[PDB]
Structure formats: structure tokens, C-alpha cells
Ligand binder design. Sequence first.
Ligand SMILES: CO[C@H]1[C@H](O)[C@@H](O)[C@@H](O[C@H]2[C@H](O[C@@H]3CO[C@@H](O[C@@H]4CO[C@@H](O)[C@H](O)[C@H]4O)[C@H](O)[C@H]3O)OC[C@@H](O)[C@@H]2O)O[C@@H]1C(=O)O
Ligand SMILES: *[C@@H]1O[C@H](CO)[C@@H](O[C@@H]2O[C@H](CO)[C@@H](O[C@@H]3O[C@H](CO)[C@@H](O)[C@H](O)[C@@H]3O)[C@H](O)[C@H]2NC(C)=O)[C@H](O)[C@H]1NC(C)=O
Length: 444
Amino acid sequence: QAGTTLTVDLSTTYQRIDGFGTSEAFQRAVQMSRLPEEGQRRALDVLFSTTNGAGLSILRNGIGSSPDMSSDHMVSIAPKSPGSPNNPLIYSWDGSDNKQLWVSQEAVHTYGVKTIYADAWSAPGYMKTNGNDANGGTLCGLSGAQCASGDWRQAYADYLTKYVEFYQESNVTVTHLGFINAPELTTSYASMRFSASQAAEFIRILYPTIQKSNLTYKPTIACCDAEGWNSQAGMLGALSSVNSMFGLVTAHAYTSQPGFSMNTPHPVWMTAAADLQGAWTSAWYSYGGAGEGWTWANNVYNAIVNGNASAYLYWIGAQTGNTNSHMVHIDANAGTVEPSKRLWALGQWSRFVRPGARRVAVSGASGSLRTAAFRNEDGSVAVVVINSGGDAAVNVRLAQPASAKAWATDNSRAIEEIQASFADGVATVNVPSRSMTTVVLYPA
Ligand SMILES: CO[C@H]1[C@H](O)[C@@H](O)[C@@H](O[C@H]2[C@H](O[C@@H]3CO[C@@H](O[C@@H]4CO[C@@H](O)[C@H](O)[C@H]4O)[C@H](O)[C@H]3O)OC[C@@H](O)[C@@H]2O)O[C@@H]1C(=O)O
Ligand SMILES: *[C@@H]1O[C@H](CO)[C@@H](O[C@@H]2O[C@H](CO)[C@@H](O[C@@H]3O[C@H](CO)[C@@H](O)[C@H](O)[C@@H]3O)[C@H](O)[C@H]2NC(C)=O)[C@H](O)[C@H]1NC(C)=O
């Protein structure tokens, strides 16, 4: 044939895409802050730049639960107990939030990011059955968790609301708010155990607290950052009584993969995935291993197409260390920043599939090509082609554009523009070998 023709059907729609992003929690933002100004700027550019970076459109921040910044802990805005939940909470704002406020202010005001997801791993220790933000335990006052010290549920809702207000008064709007992380998992770090029933119980307290607050923008409540699709899907029954009081479902890709559509009315975000203990690799493709850029391009495809995800977040953007827990390597001694091809994989999506995009049908792929298509709010149509074979001539059309452009990521290209020859509404591209290519059709 005269290449492979991919035809986009704008009349067949699926989920909305809210975007793509990562976190700088657990003092990864502090590691970035220690770089020379040029290293700082390069780290921020590769994460958020829509011209020379991954164009990430969501930042996930931790709402620190710890009493201090020991180790990699995130200090809380209220690290000292008031003794009783009947006493006002004592807020001790540091103007920094574990250097996440600076990353957020750069994302929003330098790079145009509009989606800021703040998620607590735990309440402060004095609000919990175990008196500690680490080693699990549950919020005092929930069903099954009566504490000698009192019922701290309203206090935790006031606390989360105050955290959003500190960000607001620092000119950052938190758009989404989570109050647990991995509620099925006890860990040696910030962790807190809620059943799905307890999550619903708390949402019924947190929703009116937010709606009655003086916040300028009322953030959408999220739940529950379970460590896999399967674990989160098991919480949806109990959450269904409060579907009027939260608006985002969140889950990771650790204990199961995002390979089916959850039964919820809400958008579903895959909010953390990584090759956490794999030895550092920057490569796009070596053999299809767990850390390679190629693998992560495909992991995103699977989450969107098979998991019905509206967003995809790698665990950490930039940090130090020699595992694939993160996309961007910091060498603290050299003061340098090196993006892996996992950074470019997520950017090969995020640069072109912007917030509000609607996934749409595309036909004509077979064999070595996996394809998806997205209609942006500006009417630009982004067609993803993941090519596991040799160079593939592809034609991209609607079932009408005035111009086209194309970019590819592979072993020698980092979201590099390639030719998109444009004739009578049809873009013709050479999709490189073992690449992810995005072809964009633009209205006038
Ligand atoms: C080599 O050190 C790595 C660790 O391997 C890695 O876990 C991470 O540690 C962070 C930590 O992150 C976890 C990671 O994602 C979730 O937990 C996973 C769920 O699935 C299980 O099967 C895995 O074993 C879990 O790790 C969880 O929701 C995150 O919080 O966060 C706390 C930090 O204190 C800790 O450093 O990264 C390190 C590293 O990069 O050095
Ligand atoms: C893939 O995910 C999307 C969400 O990102 C799912 O969309 C949701 O679909 C349900 C069922 O159609 C929608 O429920 C309807 O909502 C309206 C209000 O807008 C309500 O009045 C109707 O009675 C109905 O309950 C839900 O709105 C919609 N959510 C969004 C955010 O669009 C979709 O169902 C998922 N796909 C699969 C195959 O599961």
C-alpha cells in the first residue's frame, strides 16, 4: 500500500485526558533546590517546558505529615499537637512546604501548569491511633478508631483546608485534594490505614469543610491512591455513597496494572508508577527492560487505552540516586541534571495531548503499529504511533486540518521534530524504527 493510513473518527469519543505529571515529594524538591541556578532551571525546564521539555501538565505534592525534616521526611504545617481536638490547631508555616511550593510556583507561573494535586500520606501523628505519622495507624474518631485523646476527624479536615489556604496565599491554586495514600499499606514512612468505609466516612466530613471554607477555588476531593487498579477498584463500592462529594479516583501501578476500566463515574488518574529498584538506565530501547523509555511509552498507552486513565504520573521527576524511581537524574556533586528517556516518553505524550483533550477513535493500524488519537480543546488532533518495527511510512487524516507537524522519540531523538508532509488534509510521515511518534493535525 502507499504507507499505512491512520484515519481519525472525531465522532467516536472516549475519556477526557487531564494530563501527565509527577511529584517532588519526600524532599526530592529540596534536592532540586540545592543545584546551581542553571541546574535548577534545567531540571524545571525538562519537567515542565512546552518548548524544550516534557511539558508535564500536573504536579502531585505531598501534604507533609512529619514532625521535622529528618531523613527525607516532609515536615507538616502543624507539627506540634494542641493536646485536644477541642483546641485550635497550631500552624507553623515555613513558606516552603519541603521546597514543593517553589516547584509549584515555577510550574504554574513560569510554565503555565494549572493542575496541582495535593495528597497527604498521613495525618500528623497526634491525630492517629498510634501517635505517629509513620507505621500505619488510623485517624482518631473514625468508626473502629476511638482514641483516648479525642475525635480528630474535623481537625484533620480543617488541617487539609488550611494547607490549601497556605498555598492560595502563596499564589498557587491546589485543584485536587487527597487525604490518604496506599490506605491498604503500613510502611516505615508516612502511612495511614483506612478501609473504604472509613474513606467514605471522612469524605462526608471533608466535603462540607471545603464547601463552607473561604477558599477562592474549592478543590475536588480525590480517593484513594491505592497501590494498584485492583486495590482501588475494591474501594469503589463503599465510595459510591459519597460520589456527590468527591470527583477523582486515583491509583498507582505497583500491586496491579491499569489494564481494565474501573466502574466509577469519576475520571481515574494513575498517580504513581516507576521501576523503583531497577538500576539506573537513560536508554530508550535496549531489550524492552522495565526501566527503558520504550517500555514506559507503552505503559502510558496501556493505562490510557486499556485502563481508561485520564492522567498518568511517574512517581518522581528529578532526584539523586541510582535507581529508576525517577525520570531525571541529579548528580549533586557535578550540579548537573540528566533526563532519562522515561522523561522523554512521558513528554512524547504530554507535549501534544494537553489538558481537556478527548480521546477519539483511530483506525488503520495493524502489525508493528499501536495507535491512539486525541482531540485537543483547540481542535488540534494528536495521533500517537508506537512503532515496534522498522521505519514505517504512515499517512494521518480525519474521516479538516490546514497544517501538520510531527515529533518522535527513539534511541537518538528526544521529542525531535520530523517532517510531516501535508497535502489536502493528509499528513505523511516516516515513523522511525522502535519509536513513539506523535503527528498533530492543526486547524487554521
Ligand atoms: C531504592 O530506594 C527506592 C525505593 O525502592 C522506592 O520504594 C522509593 O522509596 C520512597 C517511597 O516511595 C513509595 C513507592 O511507591 C509506593 O510504594 C510501592 C508500592 O508497591 C510495593 O510493591 C512497593 O514495594 C512500594 O515501594 C508508595 O506509595 C511510595 O511512597 O516513598 C517514601 C520515601 O521515603 C522513599 O524513599 O524510592 C527509593 C529511592 O528512589 O531511593
Ligand atoms: C472511562 O472513564 C470515563 C471517565 O473519565 C467514564 O465516563 C463516565 O461515564 C459515566 C457512565 O456513562 C458517566 O455517568 C453520567 O454522568 C452524568 C453527568 O455528567 C449523569 O447525569 C449521568 O446519569 C451519568 O451518571 C460519567 O459522567 C462519565 N464521567 C465523566 C467524567 O465523563 C467512562 O464511563 C469510562 N469508560 C468505560 C468503558 O468504563
